[PDB]
């Protein structure tokens, strides 16, 4: 499957001029475009090599569309300020998520538009792609609006054609990338500890994409409980690393095994210290 997700960020900043506006888009799990306000020359630029396959009109087109949006929001920050009854002396945030997904058959599986005011759901279009779900009375206001204005109707078309259609191009503009797969290199490390016990650590490094799964088992069953774990992290060179550890009775080290599941690993990996 594949997706096209645009992440919107609007943040007002008292006594510091117009709200800051950021537009970041991701294909599957890759940043292919960016648009910042504060930046010297706010040009909706590319973050992917393969995005060179777009003439100066795409750029120019998407940059105006953006400057437009940037404006609708400053108004929305003001709109919301009115709804909730909050002063002009407070910093606030608007968060939107627009995009769509297609299956092996490029046929749209799920599309959506989700909002968040100050780090909390504000409103979001339903799977039905025709009705909305509001978080608070404020959203209701907007819902009332968008209902008569048939917004969900207009957003239904975007997700089916427009989006899915652009989501086709891009994929072709850089298939030899958004399809690559790097195999998680794994190993274990021994570490001494107080009152005699030991910490076996399982490493996975330089893998891609990002979701991989690391788990420890003991004589068959997973120790999904009583095993430390870190959030998958980025090395910095397009790759990701992550590890999982567990405390085991010194001497009785071998009775444990580490399992690595990843879309690059045809078969899950088995490790041991």
């Amino acid at each position: 499957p594949h997706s096209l997700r645009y992440f919107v960020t609007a943040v007002s900043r008292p006594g510091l001029g117009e709200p800051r506006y950021m537009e970041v888009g991701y294909v599957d799990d890759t940043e292919f475009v960016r648009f910042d306000s504060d930046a010297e020359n706010p040009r909706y630029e590319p973050r992917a090599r393969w995005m060179e396959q777009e003439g100066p009109e795409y750029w120019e087109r998407e940059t105006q569309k953006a400057k437009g949006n940037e404006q609708s929001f400053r108004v929305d920050l003001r709109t919301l300020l009115g709804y909730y009854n909050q002063s002009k002396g407070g910093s606030h945030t608007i968060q939107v998520i627009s995009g769509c997904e297609v299956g092996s058959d490029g046929r749209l599986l799920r599309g959506y538009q989700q909002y968040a005011y100050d780090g909390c759901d504000y409103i979001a279009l339903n799977e039905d792609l025709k009705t909305w779900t509001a978080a608070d009375m404020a959203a209701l206001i907007t819902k009332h609006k968008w209902e008569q204005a048939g917004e969900a109707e207009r957003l239904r078309a975007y997700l089916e054609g427009t989006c899915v259609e652009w989501l086709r191009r891009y994929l072709k503009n850089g298939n030899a990338t958004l399809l690559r797969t790097d195999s998680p290199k794994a190993h274990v490390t021994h570490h001494s500890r107080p009152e005699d016990k030991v910490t076996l650590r399982c490493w996975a490094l330089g893998f891609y994409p990002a979701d991989i799964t690391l788990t420890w088992q003991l004589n068959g069953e997973e120790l999904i409980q009583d095993m430390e774990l870190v959030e998958t992290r980025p090395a910095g060179d397009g790759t990701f690393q992550k590890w999982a550890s567990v405390v085991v009775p010194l001497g009785k080290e071998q009775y444990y095994t580490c399992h690595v599941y990843h879309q690059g690993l045809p078969e899950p990996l088995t490790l041991r210290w």
Binding site: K65, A66, T162
Partner: peptide
């Protein structure tokens, strides 16, 4: 090509 946003 991000869609263009309707006001809240």
């Amino acid at each position: 090509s991000i869609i263009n946003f309707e006001k809240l």
